[PDB]
Protein: Ferrous iron uptake transporter protein B
Amino acid sequence: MTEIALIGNPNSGKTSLFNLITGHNQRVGNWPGVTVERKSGLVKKNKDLEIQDLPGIYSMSPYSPEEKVARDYLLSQRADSILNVVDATNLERNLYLTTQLIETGIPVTIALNMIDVLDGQGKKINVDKLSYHLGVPVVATSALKQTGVDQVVKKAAHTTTSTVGDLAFPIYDDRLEAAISQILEVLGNSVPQRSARFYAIKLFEQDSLVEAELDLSQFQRKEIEDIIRITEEIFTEDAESIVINERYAFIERVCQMA
Ligand SMILES: Nc1nc2c(ncn2[C@@H]2O[C@H](COP(=O)(O)OP(=O)(O)O)[C@@H](O)[C@H]2O)c(=O)[nH]1
Structure:
């Protein structure tokens, strides 16, 4: 019925949560022809929902096979929803992947895990103000104390590709936004409308996998090269770095509440 994808940074509490949600309704196996573990399973309480676990990754780079597995699954549109496990204690760095996940076009829910530790240190997070400015639902969870779990799985199940109409994509500096829009318009119907922005930013970044597994015309390829060149001249920096700078700048802007 409903396909929810669990993903986040290594040691954010993925396995911990995954175990509490699925119980022993788990199946361990293979991603095709890749030396990467594949596990999935039914939600213990709502048996019509299935959770597909994804590799612990810091970002959708084209290098490690763990990230090719994650990129491919989330762009296959098999998942109805993305349940993002975020470490509360290292909130800033965790959101880096989050911004990339949102761009896939599959609705993202944040399980702000390890909320118990946050209290011990003294640091606080405004869950309401964070959620709104980030544009995604945020449910504080603790895999230790076992709080927020059922509340986040419920949120995830109701935040799907068939429920969500308006998807707030992280808006960056106008100069980069001009480029994304220029790449998008040129792409036309060559990319899935949902994943359009993911592919657009990946083409700007000059991503190996995206370019290779996309049959773009001579006209399209030339136009995308021009846009990249001029944007590099405007920012006086390479395309990969403009995007990295823009993600963190957005992350600090969102942390105007935290
Ligand atoms: N205090 C606290 N610890 C947690 C919580 N969730 C996970 N952990 C701890 O995080 C460590 C790694 O958990 P794990 O699920 O393997 O992280 P993963 O690599 O994302 O799967 C373990 O030692 C857990 O005790 C939590 O909500 N609160």
In short: The first strand starts at residue 2 and ends at 8. The chain has two domains: 1-171, 172-258. Residues 218-235 form the longest helix (18 residues). The beta strands are 2-8, 26-30, 37-42, 49-53, 81-87, 108-113, 138-140.
